[PDB]
From a paper:
GLIC is a bacterial homologue of the pentameric ligand-gated ion channels (pLGICs) that mediate the fast chemical neurotransmission of nerve signalling in eukaryotes. Because the activation and allosteric modulation features are conserved among prokaryotic and eukaryotic pLGICs, GLIC is commonly used as a model to study the allosteric transition and structural pharmacology of pLGICs. Unlike the other pLGICs, GLIC displays a particular activation mechanism in which protons, rather than a sizable agonist, trigger ion-channel opening. Here, experimental evidence for carboxylate binding to GLIC is provided by solving its X-ray structures with a series of monocarboxylate and dicarboxylate derivatives, and two carboxylate-binding sites are described: (i) the ‘intersubunit’ site that partially overlaps the canonical pLGIC orthosteric site and (ii) the ‘intrasubunit’ vestibular site, which is only occupied by a subset of the described derivatives.
In attempt to check whether other dicarboxylic acids with different lengths are also able to bind GLIC, we solved crystal structures of GLIC in complex with malonate (diC3) and glutarate (diC5) at 2.9 and 2.65 Å resolution, respectively. The first carboxylic groups of malonate and glutarate occupied the position of acetate, with a similar interaction pattern with Arg77, Glu181 and Arg105. Indeed, all of the monocarboxylic and dicarboxylic acids were found to bind in this pocket with a similar binding mode for the first carboxylic group involving Arg77 and Glu181 from one subunit and Arg105 from the neighbouring sububnit. For dicarboxylates, except for malonate, Asn152 from the complementary subunit contributes to the coordination of the second carboxylic group.
Numbering used by the authors:
A (entry chain C), B (entry chain D), C (entry chain E), D (entry chain A), E (entry chain B): 5 to 315
């Protein structure tokens, strides 16, 4: 089998379309997602053209092996897609209508900077390598691009699934390549992070600040050091559900900053006890009284500063 | 091979049936389950019809490749089902009786709102895309729908396995699609959650309340802070066996509310010590005496309120 | 290819045999085990019969595709078995001797009630569906049923591998099915549970009881609360190695009961301190003195009661 | 295709050879390792013999399907090996030289008794089942047995890869089986266990013994209980990287014995406090003074005893 | 199919090229990485020569099965590569231009010594075994060696992807083997290690040193002991995170050294209390005063020494 011949010197336009059936397994650590969709391809092959009157039949159905099909591949997939051909239909003029159902694990980078208040643009890149006889260019048939109403991505809100209609045409290893960008716009469902990580984390911090209404060094040491260990447990829990980034994430910045608050609380608790032992509780009382205001005020201001920088 | 031709303008009715052999791996986090079943298909192909008298044989057995078989697919599967054809039998009138054994990982969403006292409706959606020549419509042969008596789903009680007999007929990419809903009704075995999470969690909370019968600030700080850490441990344990939901679960609500009880106990412990140091233990005693009643009463009432909202 | 014709109206007897080569991956959580074995099948096909004198050869070797082979399947397998045909031999009378080497992940339920002092009966169910022309019945050739001497199942003792010689003959979807039960009897190697879970757990419990020889409320609170947290660590460790059961397991009962001992010790520690503060240490001393005997005595008796109910 | 006929009544000698390319994934819990190697087979088939003068070529290359190849299998593999035929070469006398590249997950039991100062002998068992016409016996061609210089097994030192040249010839299901033992001798790289488990574990034990230079019961309770909890963390850590053995391992014995030291330290701490409260600190002092010497002396002696029994 | 015949006694030169499409899953524990690339092969087969005037085509396209293709394999891959042939083009002179898209899990050793400030040279080894008729030698076509601009390896910086143009020609099992070394130079993104492991770890070490400004033994015991439990909870981590090395990594040496600081602080805390109880706080004060300077000074110097030895 050979590719369709050009009437003039024009390339072959393969009209593409992806219709999402299932969206699942968005792995943040792996920066991958799994997809189950329909891939529709359409091109003109005049060699397959027929007179509908003389043939009786308006449409002709073919097996993949029987006709020439353009080698369309996905750029950002882990292993080559599992594909099952649904139908191949030839119209009288020779227009082929290919339809397959596929499943693929797509590699798409995520921006964790605003986590867990981040939004992502997942990509599915379609590509075709031009052949020796003629060049192949990709196109988007918007009527065959979409997603099923039941398509849900656990822990995410699906906003849109659109295609950048203009292909990226470039040269690779002395041959022309036509690439298409299918974009799935999603936003993270931050809800669960509030009662499970954010609020538990703040409670333990506020518990550490009760040491500013205590003169008992032994109890203060217990309060500040214990809550610090609960914070490490949370810090570890958070970094296990995320990949290692060469930048700070929003949660990462807050979590890190809270260590400084624990450290400074230890200094305060230490200073207050030292002064008390030195028989100067007057200075120790003023420092502790200031801390009561200073710690929540600086925490509240530092968080306004961080939220401003990240959002 | 081509589809059977219509006698009049009628579509082709493919009578379906799923008989469950094994049910396993209900993954809560993934919202998937694995199934091993029989898929039975039946349709009329008059081209395969034969006179039983002249043929001698009352039934004719065929290989899948030898005859036209409708392309029936599962909508909500991770990867395309692994299928092994058991038998294909043609009756004298041309009625084909197809039987295959399959295994599939089914994607079915879960309602975690009443966890671990939740019940679910798992779905298996069958679909067929109509061809060029004629439309294909799905049907349910109730005689061939069921499940084996030994079918067990670890940690779940299987109530029913029925089919919504009326197919969902719709249009997708200029063709007709006939969808069927097979529903597996299951209820969670909550038993283990009581001696492993619920009762241990309440014990540690009641241990924290013994600080209301203690004047020792250093001991109270130990009691309330230490038990709080065991609660953080149980909170993490519970959320590791669950996905992130944009809603509050029953266990989630209880676990969250218990943080407030720990926080308020820390305030009490702090208040009692402050007053005692300020040489006013009469106020400290009245607050501690009230707490002894207030904490269990408000906990018992708050739980009645929550159970009412959730059930 | 068609099945062998009956001389009279008799069904076809397929003599089976499973010879275990390797046993591995007994997953308690999953209630599965992996096997690697030989499957031997034998049936009479008179169409394949030959005169040994004129043929010279006493035996004739065939390729699977060349002759009719009964569709034998495993009921309780995750995915269809990986099978490699070793040999197919036809005797002069037409007796076929089939041999294949297979590997399968078998789903077999486990009874955790007596864990880790439990014994299991793993099952491998063989099945054959009767065909259009004639019925197929399964049989056991005890001479071809066994296991290799080196067959080891990590953390288990293999007692026996036998077959229930009488098949379960029943009707499913208007056809006869002949099922066979191959039983692998195994007992759990409890040894490791004693120095890793059982003894460490008792040590921490006995450490908590040293609070009955202490008047230091602050120290007692530390003793009882710290050891309680280690018990939570062990409970979690144990429940991670097991599936969630709708019944109490032996270890589960002991672990749960120990929480009650920790709770009552907290009550004692609280009571002793309250009385001491109320200036009545005479009552506090008598309660603490009684606890010294009561706690080990009630623990020893409660365990005798539990061991009696479980074994 | 049939096996080569015997000139006299002799069996067929298949000369084997395994040349390791890559060694990886030695899983201690699973008692498995992954291998990537060359399998070379050589036998005489006089039916394939040719005159080198008349033929023109001194060697003839064949496709697997074209000639008879002995069904050589691995005994101790999880799933049947992934094999890719590299070459099949026939010499003028009819000597066939088969070469394939394979990858397999090998099940080989491990002796954990001396962990992490243990050495293992990994096995790869080759087997051949004799056919109807003639018997097949395995042999070792030492010239084709080896391993690549770059072959590394992460966390292990590879000592040797040799073959037990004499095959284990036995009868199974009325047919002769010839088995070969390829042995990969390896020793564990214990280094990392010293700064990560052994030394951290000793430091915490020695920290617990500082309670013998303290009269503060409240501090001693903290010292001994805290370090006891950190010992439980190291115990749990160790047991996660190991399978459940029906015997005591070296690390297991030391870890277990250390619990006894923590228990006896709790008794001492308790005894010292009781006597001091009873207004007899003179005994309490003598018991504490003895403990300072007794604990390290008994620990040092007990360890000499254990190392002697284990090595 | 047979290999191309030599015009003179020359070997066959197969010009290779790897163009990386995707880089992912660099597993430090496993010392593996996953790759998705293009493999281009080119050789001369004069038997495939054709006249474009007669064939009516300037370049001929072939199916893999139709022509002789050299058996090129990857040395350091876990399982045989998933390959999909993109194109096979033969020009009139008989020069074949093969192109395939592949995905493989490559085994490449990592040098964790300077971790997490470590740089690595990942290798992809191409190999060809010479055949009976003629020798096959590998070559590098630099024009067809590269990587896509979007190629990202999570947590790593990709520096270069080059090929050692001179093949390693050697003899293995009486045949010539031609090996090629494709080198991917990468450097680890250490950023995340600083706010997640390094700084949290130093904070807890500095918190432990506040015991040098405290006379409260009970509080110092909590301080040094509790922070030690967290320097433990860290190191699991770095350990959870790495393979076991027969050498010391940079982070490993720092973590190990920190344990000595915690141990010596316990000695100090113990010494100070003993002297205080012995009614000699003047010695205790001088030791504690020195410790305040000695501990940070020795820590700062020890770290300069370590950083010097590692870098
Ligand atoms: C006036 C005291 C200020 C203390 C500031 C502490 C700075 C810590 C710098 C950390 C750098 C990252 C490092 C050890 C920190 C111990 C601090 C002990 C404070 C004792 C105060 C005594 C009462 C006068
Ligand atoms: C201290 C405790 C941590 C503070 C967390 C503050 C949340 C925040 O900063 O939330 C940020 C997000 C906004 O996200 P966005 O709309 O996608 O930004 C796009 C906007 N631009 C383009 C103009 C920059 O607000 C929300 O809607 C969630 C509010 C949740 C409140 C949680 C309180 C706990
Ligand atoms: C602290 C709070 C502990 C939780 C208490 C159980 C919650 C509950 O009462 O759960 C209730 C569920 C059953 O609910 P259902 O029949 O499925 O709902 C249908 C409700 N409609 C139709 C009215 C909407 O469990 C039970 O059978 C209760 C047994 C568990 C007792 C655990 C005691 C500890
Ligand atoms: C005479 C004291 C009896 C105490 C019985 C405690 C019953 C606990 C019931 C738990 C139900 C599950 C729930 C809070 C338990 C706090 C108990 C405090 C005891 C204080 C004693 C004061 C000394 C007179
Ligand atoms: C704290 C409680 C610790 C648990 C004590 C062991 C429970 C037990 O006694 O377990 C019993 C099982 C054996 O039972 P079986 O022979 O399989 O039962 C069959 C009984 N019929 C057929 C009559 C019904 O283990 C043993 O051999 C006991 C050795 C373990 C001792 C551990 C000491 C710590
Ligand atoms: C807690 C006590 C610390 C643990 C002591 C290590 C055990 C040991 O001494 O182990 C011994 C093994 C070597 O054993 P082998 O020579 O291979 O046995 C074969 C012997 N036969 C054939 C005679 C039976 O390690 C060593 O070379 C010791 C180095 C490790 C020192 C770690 C110090 C911490
Ligand atoms: C003068 C005090 C020197 C202390 C030397 C400690 C050596 C520790 C060696 C560890 C080897 C690894 C092993 C137990 C260590 C307990 C040390 C208790 C110190 C008590 C000081 C009393 C005040 C005079
Ligand atoms: C506790 C101690 C924490 C570790 C301190 C940093 C280690 C270091 O100095 O790391 C060094 C590496 C870079 O090394 P390189 O340039 O690739 O080596 C090549 C050098 N030759 C050729 C001379 C051998 O990182 C840096 O640029 C340092 C930035 C990290 C600072 C973290 C502060 C906390
Ligand atoms: C003191 C250190 C506590 C560490 C907490 C780790 C919990 C993380 C579990 C994450 C599972 C994915
Ligand atoms: C004193 C704090 C104990 C913390 C125990 C955390 C263990 C984490 C286990 C995570 C396994 C994936
Ligand atoms: C402060 C301690 C928090 C520790 C939480 C540990 C939970 C481990 C869950 C493992 C189950 C897979
Ligand atoms: C109160 C702290 C409980 C921590 C339990 C951790 C158990 C982790 C075991 C991991 C096994 C895979
Ligand atoms: C009381 C604290 C128990 C800590 C348990 C540590 C869990 C180890 C996880 C190992 C990762 C494979
Ligand atoms: C008491 C020390 C427990 C610390 C262990 C934390 C385990 C984290 C596991 C992370 C695994 C990916
Ligand atoms: O035929 C199919 O498998 C796709 C299912 C159609 C849809 O429900 O979106
Ligand atoms: O797999 C089969 O062929 C039938 C299984 C019958 C059953 O549920 O026991
Ligand atoms: O794998 C085989 O073909 C035979 C296994 C023989 C045995 O039990 O060792
Ligand atoms: O993969 C191959 O075909 C040869 C392996 C050669 C080697 O050990 O490097
Ligand atoms: O045709 C291909 O699949 C490779 C994609 C080219 C590239 O974008 O690097
Ligand atoms: Cl395609
Ligand atoms: Cl693809
Ligand atoms: Cl189908
Ligand atoms: Cl499907
Ligand atoms: Cl079969
Ligand atoms: Cl099966
Ligand atoms: Cl073979
Ligand atoms: Cl094998
Ligand atoms: Cl024999
Ligand atoms: Cl190749
Ligand atoms: Cl390869
Ligand atoms: Na084609
Ligand atoms: Na304390
Ligand atoms: Na057959
Ligand atoms: Na070829």
């Amino acid at each position: 089998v050979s590719p369709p011949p050009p009437i003039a010197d024009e390339p072959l336009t393969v009209n593409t379309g992806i219709y999402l059936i299932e969206c699942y397994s968005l792995d943040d650590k792996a920066e991958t997602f799994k997809v189950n969709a329909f891939l529709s391809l359409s091109w003109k092959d005049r060699r397959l053209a027929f007179d509908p009157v003389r043939s009786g039949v308006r449409v002709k159905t073919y097996e993949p092996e029987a006709i020439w099909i353009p080698e369309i591949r996905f750029v950002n997939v882990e292993n080559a897609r599992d594909a099952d051909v649904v139908d191949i239909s030839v119209s009288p003029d020779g227009t082929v209508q290919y339809l397959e159902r596929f499943s693929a694990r797509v590699l798409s980078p995520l921006d964790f900077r605003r986590y867990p208040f981040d939004s992502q643009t997942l990509h599915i890149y379609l590509i075709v390598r031009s052949v020796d006889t003629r060049n192949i260019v990709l196109a988007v048939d918007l009527e065959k691009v979409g997603k099923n109403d039941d398509v849900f991505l656990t822990g995410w809100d699906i906003e849109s699934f659109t295609a950048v209609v203009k292909p990226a045409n470039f040269a690779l290893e002395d041959r022309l390549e036509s690439k298409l960008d299918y974009q799935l716009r999603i936003s993270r469902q931050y809800f669960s992070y509030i009662p499970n990580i954010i609020l538990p984390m703040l409670f333990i911090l506020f518990i550490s600040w009760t040491a500013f209404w205590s003169t008992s060094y032994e109890a203060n040491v217990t309060l500040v050091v214990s809550t610090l260990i609960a914070h490490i447990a949370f810090n570890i829990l958070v970094e296990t559900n995320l990949p290692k980034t060469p930048y700070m994430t929003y949660t990462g910045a807050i979590i890190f900053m809270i260590y400084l608050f624990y450290f400074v609380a230890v200094i305060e608790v230490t200073v207050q006890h030292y002064l008390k032992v030195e028989s100067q509780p007057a200075r120790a009382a003023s420092i502790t009284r200031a801390s009561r205001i200073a710690f929540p005020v600086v925490f509240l201001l530092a968080n306004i500063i961080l939220a401003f920088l990240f959002f």
